[PDB]
Amino acid sequence: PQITLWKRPLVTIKIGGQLKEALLDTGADDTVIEEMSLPGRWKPKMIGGIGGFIKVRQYDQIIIEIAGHKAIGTVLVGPTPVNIIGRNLLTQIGATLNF
Amino acid sequence: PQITLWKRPLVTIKIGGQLKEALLDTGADDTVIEEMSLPGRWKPKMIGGIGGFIKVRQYDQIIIEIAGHKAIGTVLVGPTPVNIIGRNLLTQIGATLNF
Ligand SMILES: COc1ccc(S(=O)(=O)N(CC(C)C)C[C@@H](O)[C@H](Cc2ccccc2)NC(=O)c2ccc3c(c2)[C@@H](NC(=O)OC(C)(C)C)CCS3)cc1
Ligand SMILES: [Cl-]
Numbered sequence A, B: 001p002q003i004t005l006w007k008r009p010l011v012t013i014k015i016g017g018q019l020k021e022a023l024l025d026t027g028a029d030d031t032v033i034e035e036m037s038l039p040g041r042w043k044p045k046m047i048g049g050i051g052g053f054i055k056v057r058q059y060d061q062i063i064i065e066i067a068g069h070k071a072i073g074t075v076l077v078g079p080t081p082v083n084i085i086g087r088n089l090l091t092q093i094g095a096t097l098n099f
């Protein structure tokens, strides 16, 4: 699809069998999701944003569908204000910016 | 142009007579620039993201040139770690997300 930016670019994602809303975010290097349970081991990561830094749990090789497109990759879980789909998964679904 | 998302989508902007590098950020509602002077009236605002909120100065009706394309809109100025071109100006240059 072609998504204009007059409203927030929100899509539905599916992770863990559950549908959630998330923001397609070209300014996020990584994907960050609100607290939820994911399988496997996690690793620590600190990420920075506008207001400072937060600690997140890094889960690798997680199956996730984004607007109907299948991806398998890293998901960070932590106290983000909104679910964010970052460039690591935007590239898996073939997204580009165009003007 | 078509910008892929393998790396951060950075572009050159011209704002207030200055050249800056900035991130094309579909996850940002508004445009946020590091500390600089701009002419005209402003009012204080709080904006929030990962890590919490920062205080900015809101300037309305500011002309920017973004990768060669002129726009006008609100610009927020304050202690952002990265210069951000948000949706309020991405719309004006015709930027879309495509996949
Ligand atoms: C109302 O207008 C706005 C309100 C909020 C914002 S925001 O900057 O808070 N943000 C809103 C989102 C969180 C809903 C836009 C977002 O694109 C932001 C845009 C952004 C980008 C970078 C920094 C601050 C904000 N990016 C990140 O928050 C973000 C997310 C994940 C990661 C990073 C940034 C990366 N952060 C980073 O490099 O931080 C340093 C620069 C401090 C080391 C680390 C890898 S993972 C912008 C405009
Ligand atoms: Cl505006």
Ligand SMILES: [Cl-]
Pocket (backbone or CB within 6 Å): A004, B094
């Ligand atoms: Cl349009």
Ligand code: NA
Pocket (backbone or CB within 6 Å): B039, B040, B041, B059, B060, B061, B062
């Ligand atoms: Na003004």
